[PDB]
Design a binder for these strands. Structure first.
Lengths: 142, 137, 198, 36, 138, 81
RNA sequence: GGAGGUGGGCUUGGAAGCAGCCAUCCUUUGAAGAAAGCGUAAUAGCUCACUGGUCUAGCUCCAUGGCACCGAAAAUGUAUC
């Protein structure tokens, strides 16, 4: 969830894009998946929160998970260190102190991919991530 | 599906060829336990085959002949009985003690068929006694 | 499943835009040769969008297809026809719309490089499967050379004997002669199973 | 239970739009009452 | 109305649920206990049987003691009378063709099975077998 | 035994079937065989107005649908249930 | 009607469908899960998946989408055509 190892740091914010690489994607690693309809930004805590939601969901429905595992990939990783000044300070005199990473999310990336033996109880966890995430996603599959 | 209904019609028809006497009875209102008791007298004591089957489906089985006289007995809920050919009646007599006894079940009975002709309960003996079709005529 | 088409004389934005907006797909047939040369068509978007879902295979392009290429008026006029394979469907990211249909000719029986999936079948009974064995199906679809005539409809692998810690490589697939794999070395596993947690 | 977004819960609750805004009234339970 | 339980023959009725399990079917218990004592002396003792009582509204009910359960009969004829928690990994006995035949036939005369042949009630009772942990030889 | 509840409302498709139930095979002529029912005429609706129902001493409460059904069937299935 | 193995097996001072776990398997076979919800100190029961005729007719969900709706509270007086 963190580019913990040495990196240049203090990244230029950079404006968000109107599109992704143009070829209509396919799925990387699993049967069912989810994709971002609209670009934007997601914070590491947000993505990890969606992951908690999903893992804990299958864990809850251990009834469909007690077989073995219900494997899931999350394919977005925090990239840019979002920095910020304190709550009361004169503008300027430097840049913010790095206070949380962010991850550019384009118009077609696959956020979640997985093969939960039940299509029903996979589409059922589809809609259970856009609640805890910033953007509007879509239930896709292989 | 259609393939299921064709197979149900064919199996009912093959039973209709190897029997010699048929009884058609209204069986609405009746508990499952009573049906099991009826089957025991029907099969263990009289060797008979019972089927509840859809009226539209039964028409196609009787269409093969000779039970075309049983066409108007398929209005309302139908339970059919096919007795073995080497066996004469017995099941018809049982379906009567079993109808009369079981007033909580309100079975309206129906018309049975022997000699290829459906016969009235009062005329059951007269038709059975005369072997030829329209022998009295 | 004859697809219908009407030509177009177009390139990039400007015109394909109006085609899409009235409902029409800019598609291209061409022969396996070079410059590459066949007419430049438009399928009907209704025809194609319904067709990919109907097959139920997001790689439906595994199947040879047949084109009426109407040149004239009305519902059609019987004109030049096509026996072409779909080698590429450019599905839009945005929601699932369609942008481009790529058709290469194979009418002659000439060979092609095509896509076939590996649908898992024996999953009902398998010793590891009944220990619970689950897996990472490294390869779900592959590319096979071969003629136009005998083209398979798909490859339905036989995983019934996926031993507890064993795997179906590429060699074990039920090919046909002249459909030489030959484009991947058979040392690529197409599944496995492992006893992870009961 | 004035809600921004009602939710049918019991299989006998039904949605009714009247006087502009949608109620959801549940025959069985007097608890699954909602108003959007 | 009409219900079937699996009560034994020596004693009268299951003592703890004796009250409300049946006693709000308006059922008359005392003369029924006498009648069942009669049926048990008629039959032989010490075998858990299935009983298929039928009650009515006219303060008149009847009580059919047809036959014992063929599967518990299997358990009692073999020697292990248990219903295991894993019928698929814990098998209890080793049944044979002739004990299968005798058990099914003695139940064939009774109303327990509507099956007439031997192979069909054989399959019925080996279904009873594989429900719990029983391993038919052959 | 107990009570019949003939209801029938002259708005919906009217076939001679439910009027058969009203006039014959239920009314005074059939109350001759079912006299402990006090058959009368009711003039309101329940559901599919010719929805004729008969409620017995424990109430098998047997009932059949509207004009398009045969009257003979309503008679016999209210009397069987 | 939602059956009899069945009140399954286990727990349990009490569990039969429902404090609570295994089990989803037996068979009748018209139906039927080791009863869904509710509870009953267990009960029973419902009704539930799961029913025969009658219905007498175009019905139902899939999206391409279009314009609606709801969320949508400020200060002197409508006060965001």
């Amino acid at each position: 969830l963190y580019p913990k190892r040495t990196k240049y740091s203090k990244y230029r914010k950079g404006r968000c894009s109107r599109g992704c690489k143009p070829d209509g994607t396919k799925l990387g690693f699993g049967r069912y998946g989810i994709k971002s309809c609209k670009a934007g930004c997601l914070s590491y805590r947000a993505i990890e929160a969606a992951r908690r939601a999903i893992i804990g969901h299958f864990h809850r429905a251990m009834s469909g998970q007690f077989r073995r595992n219900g494997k899931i990939w999350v394919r977005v990783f925090a990239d840019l260190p979002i920095t910020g000044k304190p709550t009361e300070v004169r503008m300027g005199r430097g840049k913010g102190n790095p206070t949380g990473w962010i991850a550019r999310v384009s118009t077609g990336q696959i956020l979640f991919e997985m093969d939960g033996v039940s299509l029903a109880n996979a589409r059922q966890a589809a809609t259970l991530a856009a609640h805890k995430l910033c953007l509007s996603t879509k239930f896709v599959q292989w | 599906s259609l393939r299921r209904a064709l197979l149900v019609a064919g199996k009912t028809k093959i039973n209709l060829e190897n029997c010699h006497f048929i009884t058609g009875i209204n069986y609405n209102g009746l508990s499952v336990k009573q049906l099991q008791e009826l089957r025991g007298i029907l099969r263990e004591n009289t060797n008979t085959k019972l089927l509840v089957a859809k009226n539209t489906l039964v028409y196609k089985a009787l269409e093969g002949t000779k039970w075309e006289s049983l066409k108007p007995c398929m209005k309302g809920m139908n339970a059919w009985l096919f007795v073995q050919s080497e066996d004469i009646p017995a099941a018809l007599k049982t379906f009567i003690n079993f109808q009369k006894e079981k007033k909580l079940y309100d079975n309206n009975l129906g018309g049975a068929v022997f000699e290829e002709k459906l016969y009235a309960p009062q005329d059951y003996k007269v038709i059975e006694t005369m072997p030829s079709r329209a022998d009295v005529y | 499943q004859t697809i219908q088409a009407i030509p177009r004389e177009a390139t990039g934005r400007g015109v394909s835009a109006r085609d899409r907006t009235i409902g029409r797909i800019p598609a291209v047939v061409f022969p396996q040769s070079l410059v590459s040369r066949k007419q430049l068509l438009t399928a009907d978007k209704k025809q194609i969008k319904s067709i990919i879902d109907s097959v139920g295979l997001p790689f439906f392009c595994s199947t040879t297809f047949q084109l009426q290429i109407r040149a004239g008026q009305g519902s059609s006029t019987l004109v030049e026809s096509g026996r072409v394979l779909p080698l590429k469907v450019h599905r839009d990211e945005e929601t699932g719309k369609i942008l481009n249909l790529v058709f290469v000719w194979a009418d002659d029986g000439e060979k092609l490089k095509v896509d076939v999936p590996v649908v898992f079948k024996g999953l009902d009974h398998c010793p590891g499967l009944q220990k619970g064995g689950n897996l990472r199906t490294i390869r779900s679809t592959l590319k096979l050379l071969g003629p136009a005539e005998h083209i398979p409809s798909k490859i339905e692998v036989d995983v019934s004997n996926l031993d507890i810690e064993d795997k179906v490589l590429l060699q074990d697939v039920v090919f046909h002669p002249s459909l030489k794999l030959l484009s991947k070395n058979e040392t690529m596993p197409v599944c496995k199973i492992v006893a992870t947690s009961p | 239970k004035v809600r921004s977004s009602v939710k049918k819960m019991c299989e006998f609750c039904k949605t009714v739009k009247r006087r502009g805004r949608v109620y959801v009234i549940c025959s069985s339970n007097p608890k699954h009452k909602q108003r959007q | 109305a009409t219900i079937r339980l699996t009560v034994p023959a020596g004693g009268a009725r299951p003592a703890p649920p004796v009250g409300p399990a049946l006693g709000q079917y308006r059922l008359n218990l005392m003369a029924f206990c006498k009648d069942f004592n009669a049926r048990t002396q008629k039959y032989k003792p010490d075998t858990p049987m299935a009983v298929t009582i039928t009650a009515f509204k006219d303060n008149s009910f009847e009580f059919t003691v047809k036959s014992p359960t063929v599967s518990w009969y299997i358990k009692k004829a073999a020697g292990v009378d248990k219903g295991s928690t894993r019928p698929g990994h814990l098998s209890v006995t080793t049944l044979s063709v002739r004990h299968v035949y005798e058990i099914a036939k003695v139940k064939q005369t009774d109303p327990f099975c509507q099956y007439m042949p031997l192979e069909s009630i054989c399959k019925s009772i080996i279904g009873t077998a594989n429900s719990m942990g029983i391993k038919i030889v052959q | 035994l107990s009570k019949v509840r003939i209801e029938f409302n002259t708005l919906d498709p009217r076939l001679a079937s439910c009027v058969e139930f009203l006039a014959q095979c239920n009314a005074r002529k059939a109350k001759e065989s079912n006299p402990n029912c006090q058959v009368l005429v009711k003039r309101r609706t329940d559901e599919q107005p010719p929805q004729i129902t008969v409620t017995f001493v424990n109430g098998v409460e047997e009932a059949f649908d509207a004009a398009a059904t045969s009257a003979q069937s309503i008679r016999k299935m209210i009397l069987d249930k």
